Copies of this chain bind each other. A is one copy, B any other.
Amino acid sequence: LCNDYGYEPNVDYPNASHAGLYDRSKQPYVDTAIGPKTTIQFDHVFIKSDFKTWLAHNQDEAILLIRLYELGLLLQGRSDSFLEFYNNTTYITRTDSKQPFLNKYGKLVDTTSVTCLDIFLSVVLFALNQIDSLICDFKNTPWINLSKEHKKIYELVRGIFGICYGERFEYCPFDANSTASALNVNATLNAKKTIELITCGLIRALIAYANLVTAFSADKTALLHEILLT
């Protein structure tokens, strides 16, 4: 008969299990730290959040999604949020290359309400869908032709995934004059390279989002269960 049937004292008592001899957890006792940074709430009913755990284990990808939130703000005409987005960073020198986004990441981790987090994911998905629609338009004919709206999106999204302006192999050193002919040929190569940089950014962001929103959805099931007793 099966020996794993739902009786698991080590799962019921995780802090005591971290004192055992066979615990392999990478950061023991973190799994029981409780505060705004590890919970969400609905109607001030709190749960330990898979969504918050994801943000912590995946800071780099979280910052990718936050940059897409900022894109979403601009495309939705949220002018003040966009223009104040890098405020209150304190430093007059460079620090981390993504400093303003790290700061926003800390504030997202500190957000507990379902209402606020619903807004975050909604804007991110809006941005993801805009990028997908752009790629489909770009690739629907070999001769590149974009809708007016997608021409705008193209440049904004290129500024995130590249080709990043100002950040050598196209010059023809054997006959510099021939570079003029090369530029014509390479203009389409640069646009196609941009779309591949955007496409491979989208896939990374989609895998992150798929997992993050599933964790959030799971958190909401836990809230639905807990609320029935509270």
Contact = CB atoms under 8 A, between A and B. Distances in A.
A114 to B, nearest CB: 6
A64 interface: no
What's the dominant secondary structure at chain A's contact region?
A: helix
A210 interface: yes
A35 to B, nearest CB: 22
Residue of A42, A132, A210, A224 ringed by the most chain B CB atoms within 10 A = A210
Residue of A114, A121, A223, A224 ringed by the most chain B CB atoms within 10 A = A224
A221 B220 contact: yes
Interface string A91-130: 0000000000000000000000011001001100100110
A85 interface: no
A203 interface: yes
Contact of A227 (B121, B216, B227): B227
B217 A213 contact: yes
Interface of A: 42-43, 114-115, 118, 121-122, 125, 128-129, 132, 199, 202-203, 206-207, 209-211, 213-214, 216-218, 220-221, 223-224, 227-228
24 contacts: A42-B224, A114-B221, A118-B217, A118-B221, A121-B214, A122-B214, A125-B211, A125-B214, A128-B207, A129-B211, A132-B207, A202-B203, A203-B203, A206-B210, A210-B213, A213-B214, A213-B217, A216-B217, A220-B224, A223-B224, A224-B224, A224-B227, A227-B227, A227-B228
